[PDB]
Amino acid sequence: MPLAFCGTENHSAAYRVDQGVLNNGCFVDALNVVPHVFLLFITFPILFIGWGSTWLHFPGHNLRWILTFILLFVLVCEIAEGILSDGVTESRHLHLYMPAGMAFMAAITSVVYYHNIETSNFPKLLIALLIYWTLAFITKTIKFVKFYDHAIGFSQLRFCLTGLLVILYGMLLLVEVNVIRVRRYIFFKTPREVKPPEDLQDLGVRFLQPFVNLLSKGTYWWMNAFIKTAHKKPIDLRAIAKLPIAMRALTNYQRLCVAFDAQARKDTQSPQGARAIWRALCHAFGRRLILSSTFRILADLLGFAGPLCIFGIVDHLGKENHVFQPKTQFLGVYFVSSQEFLGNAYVLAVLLFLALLLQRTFLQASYYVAIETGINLRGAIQTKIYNKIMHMSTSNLSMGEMTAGQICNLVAIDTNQLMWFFFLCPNLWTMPVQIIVGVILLYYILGVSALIGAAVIILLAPVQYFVATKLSQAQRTTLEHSNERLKQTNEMLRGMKLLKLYAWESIFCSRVEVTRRKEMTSLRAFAVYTSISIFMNTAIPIAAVLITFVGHVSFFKESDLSPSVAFASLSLFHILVTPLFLLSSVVRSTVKALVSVQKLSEFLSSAEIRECVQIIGGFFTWTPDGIPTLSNITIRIPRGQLTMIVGQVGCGKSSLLLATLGEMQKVSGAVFWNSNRSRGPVAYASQKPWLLNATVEENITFESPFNKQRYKMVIEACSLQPDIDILPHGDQTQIGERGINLSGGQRQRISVARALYQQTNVVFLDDPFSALDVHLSDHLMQAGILELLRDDKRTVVLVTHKLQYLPHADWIIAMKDGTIQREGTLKDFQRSECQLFEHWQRAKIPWRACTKYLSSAGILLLSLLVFSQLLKHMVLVAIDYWLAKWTDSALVLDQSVYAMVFTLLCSLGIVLCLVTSVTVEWTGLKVAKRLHRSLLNRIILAPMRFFETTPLGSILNRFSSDCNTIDQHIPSTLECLSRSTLLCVSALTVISYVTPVFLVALLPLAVVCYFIQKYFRVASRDLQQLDDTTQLPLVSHFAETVEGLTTIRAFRYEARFQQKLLEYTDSNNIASLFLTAANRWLEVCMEYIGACVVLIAAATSISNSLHRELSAGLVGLGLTYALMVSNYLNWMVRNLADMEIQLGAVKRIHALLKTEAESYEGLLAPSLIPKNWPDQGKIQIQNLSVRYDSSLKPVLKHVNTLISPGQKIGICGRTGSGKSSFSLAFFRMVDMFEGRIIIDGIDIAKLPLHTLRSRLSIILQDPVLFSGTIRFNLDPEKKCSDSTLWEALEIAQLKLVVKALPGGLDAIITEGGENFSQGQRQLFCLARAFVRKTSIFIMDEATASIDMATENILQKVVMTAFADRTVVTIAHRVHTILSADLVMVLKRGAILEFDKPETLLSQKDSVFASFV
Ligand SMILES: Nc1ncnc2c1ncn2[C@@H]1O[C@H](COP(=O)(O)OP(=O)(O)OP(=O)(O)O)[C@@H](O)[C@H]1O
């Protein structure tokens, strides 16, 4: 019985060349052997030379690749037929499965060869490949025609398979000659030559997926070298790719505008938009969305080709493996019948493997195509929105502010949810087909009990739909309650010094905590209504299986257990269960999408703007019909001029200025225009100022080149170099909104500086000296503006009421009654009775997450949580093994015992799922509660120096957003991770128990999964942060656009901001595309790992059940867990990345709870120190030397100075050195590192800081009123009496507002007293000074106030001296601080001057020098 090469039967009678040379059936296989080893032996040196820049794919190569893939498929099928035929006979018959194997290796090498000949564009070297292709085409044609001459027919399998790969070689020979025809290299005198694409020619595009071969489009191979690059260096934005041509937002915008033009030509409906959006979106994006849907439909169909293989495997493995032989026997060769082919065991396993390996690639490809179309939708639709921002009128809208906030939220939420609709759009095409084919083949598998189970799953989607609706309602109510909570947090982070100064931390912490616990009750209801979603989500399959098997056994009594049917039914149940919960969310996303398209359509058909200086006819309005708001305007202003304008208060100044800008709907009239009919870049600066959220030099230069001379002149004229030094960066500080909070004169001067700077042939100033109330600054600015515009020789127009210069030396223009009266000389206004006014890197977080779970849960519930999760997964393992054992023991024939224990295990499963769903929400609720109370308590017990050190933005961000993350993001991610990784460990444990060879094949596979997980985590964290920090400047740009719109359209500088918008949108979309494609590459890699798990498990299970005779119920339970392992890895990796990103805002929350200082410590005997404390006023400071960080510069040194009782020593000094330091340390609010600080003769070094800040009143520089009730705005901690509050709020100031208030002492302080006064704040300060029996009152100077307000403050200080008589005031306004008793001038941080009489202060040198 030796090693025969062809066959040893009949004593080598197949080695007989008689009866023709070609009619020997083994000789034809030798002929088919020939071309493959010919290609191997001519293409091995080529490939080895190759293995020892620029890419261009050959024309028509995608169908080349797909024909190669399907010929690999049919060659694997012929390998299977060859194995079953050479395996049935007694001999070896090696001529049945050697030629197919060498053909498989030849096809693999000829596609590697095609890739290595696609890398180097040298087409004359695939002539050999074409000479390969005709030879095999000839040879298998011979084989097919010999089957036809031997009359096999379509009955046997190998005839059909042979004809199939004949037409394979024919079609790829036709592809080869199509390439020959196109590129014209071999026999043509002139070869066609193509160039690499411009996206390749950029070299600044790494994301080369739209221009790469089809295998890398399928498996994302180019991502690998990217993701492995990301482990050495992190992924910067410069490391990211450019926005290539097919994905450039301008190009997609052009395509979308072509769609708009095509739709608007065919329909042209003016009050439409919705149908217009429908036709435009469909015509513009169907060419990719339908392709994504097609791949998704094919992936769904090949997904449902999974349980059929389980059914065939378990049905043949249950039927004893009796036959194992083909019927047909032609010429001593056994031909496999196709039923016996598709009835084999190993063959069906390999077919299952290749079907899963194509299903679970087309699903991810469909995902990716949907994502790419969604990102191009986001790009083009945001670009269209910005284009209709670039023409939108403001006064044709009433609420132009509320609508610009609306349109920014519109852009963000609307465009994002339109993007999310085009993410989820193939689901509404496939999930119905998924469910329908699932119901159909589940009825084919099992029966009417499967229809009962399908009624369970079809009655588990409306429950999720209704639960998500109630959840969204609860989330709305929770967020609109937590908005008030966040407003309370903003009111608690703006006033740290004022609340610690007025001893108002405890009452405001309680007023925050009451709203927080109300929001916590609302969040508890939210957690219940989102726990019930998880409970229904995790108990619908258990009830489905229970009702299914209970129907088939108890209710049907039709057939046996049918384990092939059972495990196919279970796998069908999982494959049907997965889309079902997703579809309710899809329908919700569709509803949100329709609302979003309605919103953006009602936006898109809003009013546009419009289609030397001279205006003749004069009618101009805002409303597009009726009432011209500025008419009779006949004014001419040629170049070389400086027209001052004038008028009454609100007499049409900004209306005339905007009418000169061309931003008003001019009904009657003409606009002559001539630049030294098209419009020029008129410079403008509105009444309301505006600054881009950028640097101050960036808000000054305004996208223009930078010279030192004009910038120095603008910093000098507007007094900006002291303003630059007032900021810690100057020309680098983030000016305006989202940055350094400026002042109105400073912002007006910066806007005027950019207007003056912008080098224009005209300059419009719509009252710049209106808000800059610094008169000497305004006069120096006016003179420098006159000098600059005279030395620049450019036309100017200043429309204001500053009549100090307007009748003197201008070519003025006067607007009377909202119309132009006279634009001439000053003598005409001295002749129209108008001169009377003119003569007047970390990996993970494991410590912080452990600290969170430890300090949050408590082991009596953390143990219960882990135990309930483990018990639920053990119960699911138990129900699976009980189903397997019951289906096995019913086929081999206590059946009611099996059904009863199956029902009582499904009930325990449902109960444990309810328990885990309760436990997750309860753990998250207690976590958020105790973490919030810890953060609030640690934020109360803080010094004001920490609030000086760290900003409120960082504290508020890691407060609010991390509270949101630990309130609405951490419990769901924890539930998903704790179900996904535990289901994964359960399934792989079950696979290893059923197949004990699996763990041996698991360990290298798990190592590969761990390394892929590590590199994906490293890349995905950085791409997530790059997504967030790229989508932030885009809405920042939409804010700065909608805010200063008329300035941009005034400058005619729209195209540069259009390009800045397009650059911002491209930089956001490319990061979104990298995050999408990294997610999809992760899912593809883990899905091939799962397919190899399926292959090894199925192979070893069928091998040990053919021979070792396994309890084949366990084999089907193995395959249906290898499939659910296969998607448990997906959720495991995704939930691990989400838990990493969500736990990063809690590592920071714990880190900001780890900053505690300013401990209240009364170390004396507190029984007598704050009762004696009121009304003495005797705080004798004895050499108390101060420091703050105790680093480089103490201020107070050995200052042994006393304030006498009654002697209200207003002691002002140098405000840089000795004013504020003593005023801060007087209230024990600084580090007096030595000395002795007495307080009315008591020890202020051991006082209760609650009691110390209670019985020592103060005044402020920028005073503020804490929002609340009027009794809570006056004295919340005291609440003494109403008549005392009337006496305070009467005798200080504001009596005619307090008695005229709607509430009285019980009225709402409207968020700081937003329109009360600024002296009403000082009146409340005097109220708190008069109410708390406070003799002392530590005062600082007013920053900005009126002289009469300062005189009223002096009169109130006289009344405070008449009622309290103790005061210590420091004032950089030294000229009003002179009415005192004693004074101290503390220059350059020392105790330099002290004058206990006031006349010695006016007598001595330095104090009088401080008085001048
Ligand atoms: N962009 C706009 N949005 C809304 N209303 C506008 C707009 N432009 C002009 N109007 C209307 O024009 C009318 C005139 O306002 P007005 O002309 O007094 O500006 P102004 O005289 O420059 O104000 P001020 O005297 O404070 O500088 C007002 O009713 C105003 O609402």
**Is-contact 501 449, C-beta < 8 A?**
no
- 1017's CB contacts (< 8 A; 6+ apart) are 843, 1136, 1137, 1140
List the determination method: cryo-EM
Please work out whether the CB of residue 819 comes within 6 Å of at least one atom of ligand 1.
no
**Token reading at 1301:** 């208030």
Q: Report how far residue 1247's alpha carbon sits from residue 1167's, in angstroms, rounded to the nearest whole number.
A: 11
For 837: left if phi > 0, alpha if psi spans -120 to 50, otherwise beta; the answer is alpha
Q: Is 1219 annotated as a binding residue?
A: yes
CB 1356 within 8 A of CB 1259: no
CB 478 within 8 A of CB 526: yes
CB of 649 shorter than 6 A to ligand 1: yes
How far apart CA 404 and CA 406 sit, in angstroms, is 5
- H or E element at residue 915: helix 895-940
665 within ligand 1 shell (Cβ under 6 A): no
Q: Is the CB of 1165 under 6 A from ligand 1?
A: no
Of 1149, 967, 973, whose CA–CA distance to 478 is shortest?
967
SS3 assignment, position 581: helix
564 touches ligand 1 (CB under 6 Å): no
SS3 16: coil
What totals of helices (H) and strands (E) does the chain contain, helices first? 50, 21
The tokens of 278 are what? 């429908």
Distance, in Å, from the CA atom of 428 to the CA atom of 412, rounded to the nearest integer, reads 24
Report which of 28, 241, 200, 88 is spatially closest to residue 1078, judged by C-alpha positions.
241
Residues paired with residue 1232 on neighbouring β-strands, in sequence order: 1186
CA distance 1208 to 1279: 27
- What three-state secondary structure class fits 635? strand
Judge whether 655 is annotated as a binding position: yes
Strands 642-647 and 813-816: parallel
* Residue with CA closest to ligand 1 atom 18: 650
- By most ligand atoms within 8 Å of CB, the mutation choice from 396, 645, 654, 661 for ligand 1 is 654
The CA distance from 780 to 620, in Å, is: 36
Q: CA–CA separation, 380 vs 378, rounded Å?
A: 6
> Residue 490 has which token pair?
């903003």
Chain position carrying tokens 């006082």:
1247
Give CA–CA dist 316/321, Å, rounded. Answer: 7
- Closest by Cα among 409, 422, 408 to 380: 422
Please state the φ and ψ torsions of residue 1064, each to the nearest 5 degrees: -65, -40
CA 767 to ligand 1: nearest atom: 27
Q: What distance in Å separates the CA atoms of residue 1117 and residue 840, rounded to the nearest whole number?
A: 99
How far is C-alpha 514 from the geometric centre of its chain's CA atoms? 31
What the block records as the tokens of 952 is 């409120």
Q: Which class is 1169-1409 in CATH?
A: alpha beta
* Distance of alpha carbon 905 from alpha carbon 889, whole angstroms: 18
Residue owning the nearest CA to atom 8 of ligand 1: 655
Count, residues in the chain: 1412
Residue nearest ligand 1's atom 6 by CA: 395
Residue 337 in contact with ligand 1 by CB distance below 6 A? no
Partners of 741 in the β-ladder: none
Residue carrying structure tokens 């939420």: 413
| C-alpha distance from residue 40 to each of 51, 105, 127 (Å) | 16, 9, 15
630 Cα to the center of ligand 1, angstroms:
10
Through-space distance between the first and last CA atoms of the chain, rounded to whole angstroms: 125
- Give the fold, CATH level 3, of 223-304+345-459+538-603+849-1153: ABC transporter transmembrane region fold (1.20.1560)
C-beta 622 within 6 A of ligand 1: yes
606 annotated as a binding-site residue: no
Cα→Cα distances 1183→1192, 1197, 1221, 1253, 1388, Å: 19, 7, 15, 22, 18
Asked if residue 1174 lies in contact with residue 1331, where contact means CB atoms within 8 angstroms, the answer is: no
Check pocket membership of 395 for ligand 1, CB cut-off 6 A.
yes
Residue 1294, Ramachandran bin (φ over 0: left; ψ between -120 and 50: alpha; else beta) = left
The owner of tokens 């004593």 is: 11
**Cα radius of gyration rounded to whole Å, the chain:** 42
Alpha carbon 1170 to its chain's center? 53
User: Looking at ligand 1, which residue's alpha carbon is closest to its atom 21?
Assistant: 650
Task: For 809-822, give the DSSP string.
Answer: SS--EEEETTEEEE
Task: Say if 223-304+345-459+538-603+849-1153 and 1169-1409 have the same CATH topology.
Answer: no
* Six-digit token string for 520: 């916590």
This structure's resolution (angstroms)?
Answer: 4.5
Between CA 504 and CA 512, with CA 509 as vertex, the angle to 5 degrees is: 125
Kindly provide the residue ranges of all beta strands, DSSP E only, lying in 655-759, ordered along the sequence.
671-672
- Characterize 1049-1075 residue by residue with b for buried, 16 or more Cβ atoms within 10 angstroms of its Cβ, and e for exposed: bbbebbeebbebbbebbbbbbbbbbbb
Q: Starting at the edge strand that comes first in sequence, how are the strands of the sheet with 1368-1370 ordered?
A: 1257-1258, 1337-1340, 1368-1370
The reply, when asked if residue 1215 is annotated as ligand binding, is yes
How far is it, in rounded angstroms, from Cα 126 to Cα 147? Answer: 31
Q: How far is CA 1179 from the centre of its chain?
A: 56
Residue keyed to tokens 């199939």: 164
Instruction: Please give the single-letter amino acid code of residue 809.
Output: A
Residue tagged 């916590």 (tokens): 520
Q: Locate tokens 């309860």: which residue?
A: 922
- Kindly state if the Cβ of 394 falls inside 6 Å of ligand 1: yes
SS3 207: coil
The protein residue with its alpha carbon nearest to ligand 1, atom 9, reads 655
Q: Which residues pair with 1201 in a beta bridge?
A: 1181
- Provide, for the chain, the percentages of residues in helix, strand and coil under a 3-state DSSP scheme, each rounded to the nearest 5: 60, 5, 35
- DSSP label of 1269: B
Among the listed residues 1248, 1247, 1246, 1197, the one whose alpha carbon sits nearest the alpha carbon of residue 1387: 1197
Cα separation, 1187 vs 1196, whole angstroms: 8
CA pair distance 1327, 1201, nearest whole angstrom: 29
Cβ atoms < 10 Å from Cβ of 62? 11
Tell me the C-alpha distance between 634 and 619, whole Å: 10
Helix (H, G, I), strand (E, B) or coil at 766: strand
Distance (Å, whole) CA 923 – CA 971: 8
DSSP string, 916-972: HHHHHHHHHHHHHHHHHHHHHHHHHS--HHHHHHS-HHHHHHHHHHHHHHHHHTHHH
Q: Where are the domains of the chain?
A: 27-196, 223-304+345-459+538-603+849-1153, 1169-1409
Whether 627 is in the pocket of ligand 1, judged by its Cβ within 6 Å, is: no
List, in sequence order, the alpha helices (H) in 1226-1302: 1249-1252, 1270-1274, 1282-1291, 1295-1298
Q: Is the dihedral of CA 451, 452, 457, 461 positive or negative?
A: positive
Closest listed residue to residue 369, CA positions, set 275, 288, 287: 288
Alpha helices in 1154-1181 (DSSP H): 1169-1172
DSSP secondary structure string for all residues of 459-523: TSHHHHHHHHHHHHHHHHHHHHHHHHHHHHHHHHHH-HHHHHHTT-SHHHHHHHHHHHHHHHHHH
Amino acid occupying residue 569:
S
CA angle centred on 957, ends 951 and 958, rounded to 5° = 100
650 is in an annotated binding site: yes
Determine the Cα–Cα distance for residues 294 and 284; give it in Å rounded to an integer: 17
Q: Whose CA is nearest to atom 29 of ligand 1?
A: 629
Within 13 A of 1154's CA, how many CA atoms are on the CB side?
A: 8
Atom of ligand 1 nearest to the CA of 656: 17
The pairing of beta strand 642-647 with beta strand 635-637: unpaired
Distance separating alpha carbons of residues 668 and 628, to the nearest angstrom: 9
Helix, coil or strand: residue 329: strand
Return d(Cα 93, Cα 88) in angstroms, integer: 10
Q: Phi, psi (5° rounding) for residue 1237?
A: -110, 95
Cα(665)–Cα(670) distance, integer angstroms: 12
Sequence letter at residue 1144: G
Output b/e per residue, 1367-1396; b: 16+ Cβ within 10 A.
Answer: bbbbbbebebbbebbbbbbbeebebbbbbe
Give the dihedral sign, CA 137/138/140/141. positive
